[PDB]
């Protein structure tokens, strides 16, 4: 629903201290998302290069601030999609720290 | 326990 946004948002605690302004949920296993590490090395958007983009389209929801919306009172706007995630990988085991953007 | 791998499960995953 256009719902999802705005109570995960909160639920996951990322309106305690500001609006944060776009995050992205993935609807995939953790082990499919995990696995992105392994593949498809681009990147990232700030220009380091420890990014990877999946091989494969993967489900995800995305959500974005309103134009009302204003600490704290937070609004956002849900987008569901099926992209390629990029993500930056770090640590022994290799994983997902950050989530970079789709394509 | 919380890491940067735990952070991002935390903020992105929704299976």
Not at chain 1, 86 to 95: F, H, L, M, T
Request: glycine content about 2%.
């Amino acid at each position: 629903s256009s719902n999802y946004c705005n109570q995960m948002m909160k639920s996951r605690n990322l309106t305690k201290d500001r609006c944060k302004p776009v995050n992205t949920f993935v609807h995939e296993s953790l082990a499919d998302v995990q696995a992105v590490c392994s593949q498809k090395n681009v990147a990232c958007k700030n220009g380091q290069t420890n990014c990877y983009q999946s091989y494969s389209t993967m489900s995800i929801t995305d959500c974005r601030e309103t134009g009302s919306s204003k600490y704290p009172n937070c609004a956002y706007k849900t987008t569901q999609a099926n992209k390629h995630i990029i993500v930056a990988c770090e640590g022994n085991p290799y994983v997902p720290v950050h989530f970079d953007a789709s394509v | 326990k919380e890491t940067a791998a735990x952070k991002f499960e935390x903020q992105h995953m929704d299976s």
